[PDB]
Write a protein that binds this DNA or RNA. Structure first.
Ligand SMILES: Nc1ncnc2c1ncn2[C@@H]1O[C@H](COP(=O)(O)OP(=O)(O)OP(O)(O)=S)[C@@H](O)[C@H]1O
Ligand SMILES: Nc1ncnc2c1ncn2[C@@H]1O[C@H](COP(=O)(O)OP(=O)(O)OP(O)(O)=S)[C@@H](O)[C@H]1O
Ligand SMILES: Nc1ncnc2c1ncn2[C@@H]1O[C@H](COP(=O)(O)OP(=O)(O)OP(O)(O)=S)[C@@H](O)[C@H]1O
Ligand SMILES: Nc1nc2c(ncn2[C@@H]2O[C@H](COP(=O)(O)OP(=O)(O)O)[C@@H](O)[C@H]2O)c(=O)[nH]1
Ligand SMILES: [Mg+2]
Ligand SMILES: [Mg+2]
Ligand SMILES: [Mg+2]
Lengths: 326, 354, 330, 343, 318
DNA sequence: CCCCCCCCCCTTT
DNA sequence: TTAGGGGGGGGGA
DNA sequence: CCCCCCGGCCCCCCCGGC
DNA sequence: TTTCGGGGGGGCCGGGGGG
């Protein structure tokens, strides 16, 4: 859980796993003989399956059932298991695995696992289920393809439904707080596209990559805003225009000189920075924005260390202006 | 030093170099500025809208409008969050970009702007008429990025406090501006400069910078490649000059930005491969683009027009592509997560082509 | 607050006794029988706006307790705090304590209970159950889906219907007698038609009509007065527009629509609603015609709800009607 | 330093024409008599109902309510008898339950002898909720019983552009007043009065063209007239204002450009249409204006059959609806033109 | 009139475990537990009005007897049940000394436990574990999923099924004999049909019908109890001709005063539960219904929108 | 003893 | 029908 | 004159469908 | 992630009362 993050690597972690039927069978048989009720060993594996490895729950079940039924055998195991089944909410990986299984979308499967059950499965975690589905709906081998329908066409239909679900989600989290739309979202974001591409997972199930990408975009936008308001006094544009238009020319007038004149260009670069109130951190951030062929990481690492050291020394050996006086 | 796009930016109405009719209209507006209504300047990006706004302010108040200072204002949400807004100010005007706080832009309109609106002018700012100015000008950049709530908040503030402030909004498109706000403003169309005007401006920059040119056709090529974006044209001229040792030849290639090259590569990949795995790699490319501050609407427009320029596609494919682009642009307007809609558009295009 | 004549008609004519509530005869008879024999259960009045729910419950409280019912009942509505804390303290204390004035039972009126939080509704369950020996609850609502199943399980449900023609006619006659007004039969029919079963609309429109007359003591309210005050289309205008759409060419239909709207500045939405009402009665040979009509007109209404270009919307209405009715031939 | 305070008349004189010529009394409201007469009768009947003004932009709702409050109370008593809240204020459910309710339950401010002698002074106060369509449904629901319970000392006036945003109970409680769109026929008198007051010289039909272009918004028409007057004054020639100048100031596409677009569409070549539209967008024309002009051209053209008009009407409606959502003008316009070309 | 007749749901509330109908096996288990004591921690779950609170109270009374006033602590959603309450009042009750017969324990009855906060539930764990030698806990709820898994581990699960028409008829006949109510078979059939397995609802409707009309027949029952609108909505959605569906919508729902939001929500629920239609068709229907629901929430709640929704559903079904 | 069977549990803000 | 891969632990040639 | 009890804001975290 | 609103739980602050 997120709340456990502070305990990352401070304590010796010891994991206790669900004990199997064999490790406990003697205990339950001893309890049965002491308590004077008949228990068939062949059903113990079932009983644990009912309790999901909860020994305390197993003992409670035995105590409650023995009050009226003194013999536990195959003639009554099914009803006891169904009545005492532990219904725990699934986790995002399990939710994704279940929702994308084709069997539940067949006539018999849909009759056994109903649409209401699928909506409830979504509601096990309504925040993460749509992200899981959008992450893993292209990684399946479908078994629900309609005649004459390619995998690509079903993927396109699912993507359209996911876009509609995103619109509904925006509606829910607006100022009107239309939480009553949550069930509809469940259908549009998760159930419908899954029914369109349900089948067998082709590879491993992956956790949603949208959250990390969103955080990275937020960080880059913050850096871009800082750069923009450092250079506001000199430029005429918005931050988007700064990213799309100014930044390549700033790359040519800030990074290229080091790769051509070595240390002799340091002054010029600093001059440009002083003309736009840019700092060393702004320089690095600017170099961090470029994509595609203009990636700078390898180029920057290839620069001689002496040139960078001299650049830092020269920048620290002078006085610089301030665009924003706090 | 200072980039040529900034060093040679005009600082007065008489220094403007294109769209003479618009210059005359602005001069007519500045002739009797006391009863100036609220203004809304709309037109293609990078044409000179902000330059003309600053020139109009200079004509009204004087050169002091260019003495800009940056300050930071503090705001508190209902959840106790602390937000900071950068305000550019001069002795005569204020400038704000409320979209900087996203959904909290409304607060800026409801607290800061109103506070400015409820203040009368007592400083003796003597004007050409002989009397002191009675209102301060507030510029709202990217006015079309405001949420509907902030626009609604602007409405009565514009009318009640007209004697104290005058608003100048600047946008690249009026589609996202609500009807009441457009009704409350004087709309000014700012057309892009022609190719010849761009060539003249670039030639003046070249002569003032002592750059060798094999001919005047390179400037025309840059103007055509800019598609009417003067800022882009000037930046591209500077980039080419830097890349060719301050000497441009007739064979000097036109430079393109990183994101444009990436989007063109994505278009080629989409055209050549139409498969689910291709869609996965396209998702990776889209994530890379979005992460580095490329707006989703820009990506959609660029990809659509790149696809429409592919010579191997037929009329039916292009019609389907433009229809899907329309639908998914609407989806982007009403959605939260842009990647969902971009992926949907790419999947539909792949289906239509295949 | 200088006199009752200073009140709006919607409040000046609020029923004070169960005999002044019209159009809900079954509910009134049943509740009166309940009170007469001392068999009042927990009540749930469900119905659309302006049908008489609040009026009926207030009149019932007055009948049970008399003129001083206000100090003998606990009335809470959407303008008051009704969180779980209020349920835990104020409602619980009122339900568990004797009356200050008399020895009778206690009445709690939760008006607009559909605006109450789920937690408060859940907390109400055991309060209702435990103190049923001496306390009764009444819940009023327009939207039943906001009420928890547990609360509905504990209440006897009465549905308030949209007001029938006869009840509106009788109340209009009473108001005309009180106000010394004259009303034409056609104007009365138009008023009933625009009422849609809501008495508040009838009263407001009648007050506006009286304000419109130059000499209300001698001038009679004609259908023209109603259409002028409400700014609504006449049936003849709707018939002409529909006939032009279904019979003439595009130029004539466009001209007729624009002329009809400009004559009195009618709203396009009112024309759309009137034409929809007319078309519901039309017998169509093909179901596809009805499908297209309904879908396209619903889309147009939704678009209008957000504004947009009025002329384009009118042309869209014309085109949708023509295209839909082209399906009646083959 | 400090500046001597300006007089109200002098201040209003140097205000924008829309604010300068805002109606000061109910007699100055131009073409809303069907409601203004009912409101005026309240000066004597003193039984003002709860009001729901609804209509398109710039039709006179706010002006009407302000003039009504002035006429009812007077410049001395208005402030004490009015509580105004608009979209620039906080109007959450808590605000409705506490501040609005507290003001509604207060005893009315005491009129002075002069106020009683010179104004009707009805025995109630007024709460104005301007831009009420921005309020949430729960906050609106919090007003229901407050309106009815304190109606003896308080009356509510809700003003909106989209009446569907008002929940059904509130619309039921309020008497509805629909403000009609202001066009040439019903607003030319007021526009001509303003032009004469400002000594604006224009060709015959210029005011009618301005009101046609405004499309039901008198505020827009007055602003356009002021801009044209400024242009004429700066030119300093004495020539009358022409319709061409008004159209250029209003962002209307010239007819020749529209004909070029029509010919390109008639050609049907996708690449040529795309190239022409790319060149066209550089002029900065508003897509909504282009769509409106195309609708006008095609619908009233006698050279197109019924089926073509039936299809193009739906195409134009769809494009306009999409544009209303804040979409990219270039993409929407290109899609519309391509779709028309294939009809 | 200032007098009240005690409701029959309270007058004939079962006082012993033998008077509760339905869920026979669980009731016998409770009877045996009450016989021999040794009551464990238990969680009783089920739908409204089936006898969960009645079962718990009867068990507690039969177990404790004269010591009921001292050995029972009852808390429900109408009482304060925060973490502070769990840590102080419940803990003091569990620690308290009370002499009880050799096979009896103190009982804490947490009715409507699904509304309890997660913090209080967490605090209850070790209190249950440490004081189990003298105190036992009985939870009653409608949704057992709201009870955290650690608490479910320590308790015995008792899921109450819905009452069959036969048990409801038996209880209604008992009450009728006790009250000498005059009825007809059709009246009882209508009462059971409208009750939908809710004994409280059935008894309330019976009493209301008797009070308002005397004779419990079909006509009086339907006059007092309205036909559930979900069935009308199902008939509307299952109609073959668009005209029939529109007629049902206009005459049975819109003219009766049912709100558009209620109609659309009920349509969504019924479509979700329509096991007779193929799941994919149900998904398309739900998409259309959700479009209409979003439009209605936006403020455009009109008969035209619902008619358009029905037209789209019929177009899908054809 | 390493190998295998068999299962459970982690991928995850 | 078992998503891939790692950990645990009883059985055993 | 100083210390302690206990009511009230104030802040911060967490659901939100059936 | 997060755009209102409700609910809960814990931390200080300060009035009043007592010694
Ligand atoms: N049955 C009725 N008989 C007479 N007048 C009625 C009737 N129903 C409504 N009215 C009139 O409309 C006004 C409001 O009636 P209410 O009883 O408040 O309606 P309502 O059902 O409570 O409205 P909601 O549910 O709060 S929107 C009354 O003061 C009456 O003047
Ligand atoms: N009926 C009218 N009569 C005279 N002037 C009008 C009229 N309507 C609008 N105007 C003019 O336009 C200006 C604005 O009028 P408003 O009353 O603010 O319109 P509005 O309907 O309240 O606009 P919205 O709904 O806030 S966009 C007025 O000051 C007048 O100068
Ligand atoms: N099995 C039953 N046998 C006899 N009467 C019942 C039975 N179930 C409910 N009732 C009657 O309905 C009344 C209410 O029963 P309850 O035990 O309160 O139902 P409940 O399940 O606890 O309701 P919830 O879950 O709090 S909404 C009882 O007093 C009985 O009169
Ligand atoms: N020489 C000259 N340059 C101009 C003119 N107008 C704009 N520019 C240049 O174009 C650049 C971009 O102008 P800008 O106002 O920021 O674009 P916009 O606000 O997005 O429309 C400016 O930095 C100027 O250098 C002009 O009239 N003359
Ligand atoms: Mg009411
Ligand atoms: Mg207004
Ligand atoms: Mg219960």
């Amino acid at each position: 859980l997120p709340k456990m993050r502070p305990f990352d690597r401070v304590c010796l972690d010891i994991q206790f796993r669900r004990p199997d039927a064999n490790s406990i069978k003697s205990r339950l048989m001893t309890i049965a003989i002491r308590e004077k009720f008949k228990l068939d060993p062949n059903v113990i594996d079932r009983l644990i399956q009912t309790t999901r490895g909860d020994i305390r729950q197993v003992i409670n079940l035995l105590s409650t059932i023995s009050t009226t039924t003194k013999t536990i055998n195959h003639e009554n195991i099914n009803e006891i298991s169904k009545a005492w089944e532990k219904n725990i909410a699934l986790k995002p990986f399990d939710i994704a695995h279940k929702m994308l299984d084709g069997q539940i979308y067949s006539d018999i499967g849909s009759r056994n696992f109903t649409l209401n059950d699928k909506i409830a499965l979504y509601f096990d975690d309504f925040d993460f289920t749509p992200l899981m589905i959008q992450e893993n709906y292209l990684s399946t081998r479908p078994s629900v393809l309609k005649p004459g329908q390619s995998h690509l066409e079903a993927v396109a239909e699912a993507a359209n439904c996911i876009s509609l679900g995103d619109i509904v989600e925006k509606k829910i989290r607006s100022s009107e707080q239309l939480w009553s739309l949550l069930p509809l979202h469940a259908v549009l974001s998760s159930v419908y596209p899954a029914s369109k591409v349900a089948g067998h997972m082709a590879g491993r199930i992956n956790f949603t990559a949208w959250l990390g990408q969103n955080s990275k975009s937020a960080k880059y936008y913050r850096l871009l805003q800082e750069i923009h308001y450092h250079t506001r006094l000199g430029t005429s544009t918005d931050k988007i225009g700064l990213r799309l238009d100014y930044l390549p020319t700033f790359r040519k007038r800030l990074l290229d000189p080091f790769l051509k004149q070595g240390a002799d260009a340091i002054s010029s670069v600093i001059e440009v920075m002083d003309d736009y109130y840019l700092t060393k951190e702004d320089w690095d951030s600017i170099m961090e924005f470029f994509v595609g062929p203009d990636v700078t990481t390898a180029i920057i690492k290839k620069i001689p260390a002496t040139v960078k050291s001299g650049f830092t020394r020269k920048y620290n050996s002078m006085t610089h202006p301030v665009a924003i006086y706090r | 030093m200072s980039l040529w796009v900034d060093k040679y930016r005009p600082k007065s109405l008489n220094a403007l170099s294109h769209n003479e009719e618009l210059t005359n209209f602005l001069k007519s507006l500045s002739d009797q500025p006391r009863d100036l209504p609220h203004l809304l300047l709309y037109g293609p990006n990078g044409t000179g809208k902000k330059t003309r706004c600053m020139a109009l302010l200079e004509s009204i108040f004087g050169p002091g409008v260019y003495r800009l200072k940056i300050d930071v204002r503090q705001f508190v949400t209902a959840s106790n969050r602390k937000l900071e807004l950068n305000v550019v100010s001069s002795p005569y005007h204020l400038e704000i970009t409320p979209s900087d706080m996203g959904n909290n832009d409304r607060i800026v309109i409801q607290e800061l702007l109103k506070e400015v609106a409820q203040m009368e002018q007592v400083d003796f700012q003597d004007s050409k008429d002989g009397l002191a100015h009675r209102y301060k000008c507030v510029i709202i950049n990217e006015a079309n990025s405001l949420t509907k709530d902030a626009q609604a908040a602007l409405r009565r503030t514009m009318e009640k406090y007209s004697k104290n402030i005058r608003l100048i909004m600047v946008c690249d498109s009026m589609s996202p501006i609500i009807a009441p706000i457009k009704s409350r403003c004087l709309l000014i169309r700012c057309p892009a400069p022609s190719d010849s005007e761009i060539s003249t401006i670039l030639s003046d920059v070249v002569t003032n910078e002592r750059i060798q040119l094999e001919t005047k056709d390179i400037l025309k090529r840059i103007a055509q490649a800019s598609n009417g974006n003067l800022r882009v044209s000037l930046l591209m001229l500077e980039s080419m000059a830097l890349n060719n040792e301050l000497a441009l030849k007739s064979s000097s290639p036109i430079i393109k930005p990183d994101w444009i090259i990436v989007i063109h590569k994505l278009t080629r990949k989409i055209v050549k491969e139409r498969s689910v795995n291709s869609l996965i790699e396209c998702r990776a490319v889209l994530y890379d683009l979005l992460a580095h501050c490329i707006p989703a609407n820009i990506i959609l427009k660029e990809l659509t027009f790149s696809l429409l320029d592919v010579e191997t596609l037929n009329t039916t494919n292009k019609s389907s592509i433009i229809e899907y682009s329309s639908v998914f642009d609407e989806r982007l307007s009403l959605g939260n997560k842009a990647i969902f809609h971009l992926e949907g558009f790419i999947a539909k295009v792949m289906c239509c082509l295949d | 607050k200088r006199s009752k004549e200073n009140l709006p008609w919607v409040e000046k004519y609020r029923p004070e006794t169960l005999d002044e509530v019209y159009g809900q005869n079954e509910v009134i008879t049943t509740v009166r029988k309940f009170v007469d024999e001392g068999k009042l259960p927990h009540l749930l009045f469900y119905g659309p706006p302006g049908t008489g729910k609040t009026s009926t419950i207030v009149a019932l409280a007055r009948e049970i307790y008399g003129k001083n019912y206000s100090n003998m009942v606990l009335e809470l509505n959407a303008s008051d705090d009704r969180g779980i804390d209020v349920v835990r303290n104020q409602i619980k204390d009122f339900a568990s304590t004797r009356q200050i004035f008399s020895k009778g039972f206690k009445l709690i009126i939760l008006d607009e209970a559909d605006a109450m939080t789920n937690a408060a509704q859940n907390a109400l369950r055991r309060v209702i159950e435990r103190y049923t020996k001496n306390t009764r609850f009444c819940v009023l609502a327009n939207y039943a889906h906001k009420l928890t199943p547990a609360l509905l399980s504990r209440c006897t449900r009465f549905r308030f219907q949209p007001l029938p023609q006869e009840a509106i006619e009788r109340r209009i006659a009473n108001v005309l007698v009180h106000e010394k007004l004259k009303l034409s039969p056609n104007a009365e029919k138009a008023l009933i038609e625009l009422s849609n079963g809501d008495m508040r609309r009838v009263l407001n429109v009648l007050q506006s009509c009286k304000a419109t007359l130059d000499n209300p003591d001698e001038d009679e309210i004609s259908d023209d007065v109603i259409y002028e005050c409400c700014g609504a289309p006449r049936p003849s205008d709707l018939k002409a527009v529909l006939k032009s759409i279904l019979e003439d060419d595009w130029g004539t239909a466009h001209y007729t629509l624009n002329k009809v709207r400009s004559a009195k500045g009618l709203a396009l939405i009112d024309l759309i609603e009137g034409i929809v009402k007319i078309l519901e009665d039309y017998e169509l040979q093909n179901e596809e015609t009805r499908v297209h009509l309904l879908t396209k007109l619903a889309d147009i209404e939704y678009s209008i709800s957000k504004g947009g270009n009025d002329q384009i919307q009118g042309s869209a209405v014309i085109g949708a009607i023509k295209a839909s009715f082209e399906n009646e031939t083959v | 330093r400090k500046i001597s305070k300006l007089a109200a008349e002098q201040s209003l004189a140097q205000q924008p024409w829309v604010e300068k010529y805002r109606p000061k009394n109910l007699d100055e409201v131009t073409a809303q008599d069907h409601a203004v007469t009912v409101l005026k009768k309240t000066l004597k009947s003193a039984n003002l109902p709860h009001m729901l003004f609804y209509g398109p932009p710039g039709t006179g709702k706010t002006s009407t309510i302000l003039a009504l409050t002035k006429e009812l109370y007077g410049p001395d008593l208005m402030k004490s008898r009015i509580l105004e809240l608009n979209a620039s204020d906080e109007r959450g459910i808590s605000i409705v339950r506490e501040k609005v309710k507290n003001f509604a339950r207060l005893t009315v401010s005491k009129p002075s002898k002069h106020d009683l002698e010179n104004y009707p002074c009805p025995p109630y106060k007024i709460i104005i909720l301007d831009e009420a369509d921005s309020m949430t449904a729960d906050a609106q629901s919090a007003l229901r019983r407050t309106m009815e319970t304190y109606s003896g000392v308080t009356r509510f006036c809700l003003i909106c552009n989209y009446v569907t945003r008002i929940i059904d109970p509130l619309a039921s409680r309020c008497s509805k007043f629909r403000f009609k769109a202001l066009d040439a026929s019903n607003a030319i008198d007021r526009l001509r009065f303003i032009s004469e007051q400002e000594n604006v010289k224009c060709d015959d039909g210029v005011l009618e063209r301005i009101l046609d272009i405004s499309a039901g918004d008198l505020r827009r028409g007055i602003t356009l007239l002021q801009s044209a007057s400024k242009g004429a004054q700066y030119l300093g020639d004495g020539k009358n204002i022409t319709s061409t100048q008004v159209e250029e100031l209003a962002g209307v596409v010239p007819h020749d450009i529209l004909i070029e677009i029509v010919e390109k569409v008639k050609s049907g070549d996708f690449d040529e249409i795309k190239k022409y539209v790319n060149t066209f967008m550089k002029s900065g024309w508003s897509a909504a204006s282009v769509v409106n002009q195309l609708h006008e051209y095609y619908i009233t053209n006698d050279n197109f059959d019924t089926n073509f008009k039936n299809q193009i009407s739906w195409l134009l409606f769809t494009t306009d609806s999409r544009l209303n959502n804040g979409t990219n003008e270039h993409i929407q316009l290109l899609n519309l033109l391509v779709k028309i070309s294939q009809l | 009139t200032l007098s009240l007749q005690l409701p029959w749901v309270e007058k004939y509330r079962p006082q012993v475990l033998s008077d509760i109908v339905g869920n026979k096996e669980t009731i016998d288990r409770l009877q045996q537990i009450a016989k021999d004591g040794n009551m464990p921690h238990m969680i009783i779950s089920g739908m409204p009005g089936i006898g969960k609170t009645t079962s718990v109270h009867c068990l507690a009374h039969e177990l404790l007897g004269r010591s009921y006033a001292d050995g029972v602590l009852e808390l429900n959603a109408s009482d304060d049940r925060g973490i502070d309450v769990v840590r102080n009042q419940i803990k003091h009750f569990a620690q308290k000394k009370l002499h009880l017969p050799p096979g009896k324990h103190k009982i804490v009855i947490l009715d409507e436990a699904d509304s309890m906060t997660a913090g209080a539930q967490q605090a209850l764990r070790r209190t249950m574990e440490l004081y189990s030698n003298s105190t036992r806990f009985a939870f009653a709820c409608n949704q057992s999923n709201k009870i955290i898994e650690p608490l479910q581990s320590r308790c015995a699960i008792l899921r109450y099924s819905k009452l069959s028409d036969e048990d409801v008829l038996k209880r209604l006949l008992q009450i009728i004999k006790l009250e000498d109510v005059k009825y007809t078979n059709d009246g009882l059939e209508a009462i059971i049909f409208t009750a939908e397995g809710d004994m409280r609802q059935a008894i309330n409707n019976l009493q209301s019908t008797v009070a308002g009309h005397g004779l419990v027949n079909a006509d009086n029952v339907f006059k007092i109890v309205d036909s559930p609108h979900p069935l009308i909505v199902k008939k509307m959605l299952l109609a073959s001709n668009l005209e029939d569906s529109i007629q049902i919508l206009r005459t049975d729902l819109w003219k009766k005063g049912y709100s558009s939001i209620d109609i659309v929500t009920t349509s969504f629920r019924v479509t979700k539960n329509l096991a007779q239609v193929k799941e994919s068709v149900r998904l398309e229907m739900i998409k259309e219904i959700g479009l209409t629901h979003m439009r209605i929430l936006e403020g455009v709640g009109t008969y035209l929108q619902l008619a358009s929704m029905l037209a789209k559903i019929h177009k899908l079904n054809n």
